[PDB]
Design a protein around this motif. Sequence first.
Motif, mmCIF file in Angstrom:
data_model
loop_
_atom_site.group_PDB
_atom_site.id
_atom_site.type_symbol
_atom_site.label_atom_id
_atom_site.label_comp_id
_atom_site.label_asym_id
_atom_site.label_seq_id
_atom_site.Cartn_x
_atom_site.Cartn_y
_atom_site.Cartn_z
ATOM 1 N N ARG A 141 5.710 -11.049 -7.871
ATOM 2 C CA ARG A 141 6.697 -11.565 -6.925
ATOM 3 C C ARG A 141 6.493 -13.044 -6.622
ATOM 4 O O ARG A 141 7.428 -13.740 -6.244
ATOM 5 C CB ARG A 141 6.714 -10.746 -5.632
ATOM 6 N N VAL A 142 5.271 -13.524 -6.797
ATOM 7 C CA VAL A 142 4.951 -14.911 -6.486
ATOM 8 C C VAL A 142 5.525 -15.887 -7.527
ATOM 9 O O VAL A 142 5.758 -17.061 -7.234
ATOM 10 C CB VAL A 142 3.424 -15.083 -6.335
ATOM 11 N N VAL A 181 -4.703 0.041 -6.127
ATOM 12 C CA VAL A 181 -4.964 -1.382 -5.920
ATOM 13 C C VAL A 181 -4.580 -2.214 -7.145
ATOM 14 O O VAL A 181 -4.234 -3.389 -7.018
ATOM 15 C CB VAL A 181 -6.436 -1.664 -5.479
ATOM 16 N N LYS A 182 -4.619 -1.600 -8.320
ATOM 17 C CA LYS A 182 -4.174 -2.289 -9.523
ATOM 18 C C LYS A 182 -2.671 -2.565 -9.479
ATOM 19 O O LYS A 182 -2.260 -3.673 -9.793
ATOM 20 C CB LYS A 182 -4.554 -1.528 -10.792
ATOM 21 N N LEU A 183 -1.867 -1.569 -9.097
ATOM 22 C CA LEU A 183 -0.421 -1.782 -8.942
ATOM 23 C C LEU A 183 -0.150 -2.839 -7.871
ATOM 24 O O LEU A 183 0.713 -3.695 -8.052
ATOM 25 C CB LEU A 183 0.323 -0.482 -8.595
ATOM 26 N N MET A 184 -0.892 -2.780 -6.760
ATOM 27 C CA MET A 184 -0.717 -3.733 -5.660
ATOM 28 C C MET A 184 -0.940 -5.182 -6.095
ATOM 29 O O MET A 184 -0.110 -6.057 -5.842
ATOM 30 C CB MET A 184 -1.596 -3.373 -4.445
ATOM 31 N N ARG A 185 -2.049 -5.442 -6.769
ATOM 32 C CA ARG A 185 -2.310 -6.782 -7.251
ATOM 33 C C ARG A 185 -1.224 -7.228 -8.226
ATOM 34 O O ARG A 185 -0.784 -8.373 -8.194
ATOM 35 C CB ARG A 185 -3.670 -6.867 -7.933
ATOM 36 N N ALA A 245 0.836 -1.202 0.000
ATOM 37 C CA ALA A 245 0.000 0.000 0.000
ATOM 38 C C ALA A 245 0.881 1.267 0.000
ATOM 39 O O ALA A 245 0.550 2.285 -0.625
ATOM 40 C CB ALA A 245 -0.943 -0.012 1.213
ATOM 41 N N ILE A 246 2.005 1.199 0.703
ATOM 42 C CA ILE A 246 2.961 2.308 0.708
ATOM 43 C C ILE A 246 3.666 2.444 -0.649
ATOM 44 O O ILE A 246 3.718 3.526 -1.240
ATOM 45 C CB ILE A 246 4.007 2.144 1.858
#
Length: 87
Positions: free
Chosen positions: A71-72, A61-65, A54-55
């Motif tokens: 990374r997974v 939220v699009k960048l977050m997802r 979030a930081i």
Amino acid sequence: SASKSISDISFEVDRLAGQVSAFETVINKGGKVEEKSLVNLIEMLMNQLLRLDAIIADGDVKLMRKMQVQRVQKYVEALDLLKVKNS
């Protein structure tokens, strides 16, 4: 400030990693732990990961997802290779 928030997350994740190591030691010494203690720890780590994202994304939220899916992949790919390698 985002800087101090990231610092606090770093500190907190260090703490949780210390708990993981300790649980690994319990298992290595022959001990039994309840699955819910480990599931709870996973949740604690996931909460820190979400705060960090979030930081980094400034709440987008699009960048977050996208960051999470990215990374997974490293781990999913190694686990895929292992399944095909099959010993």
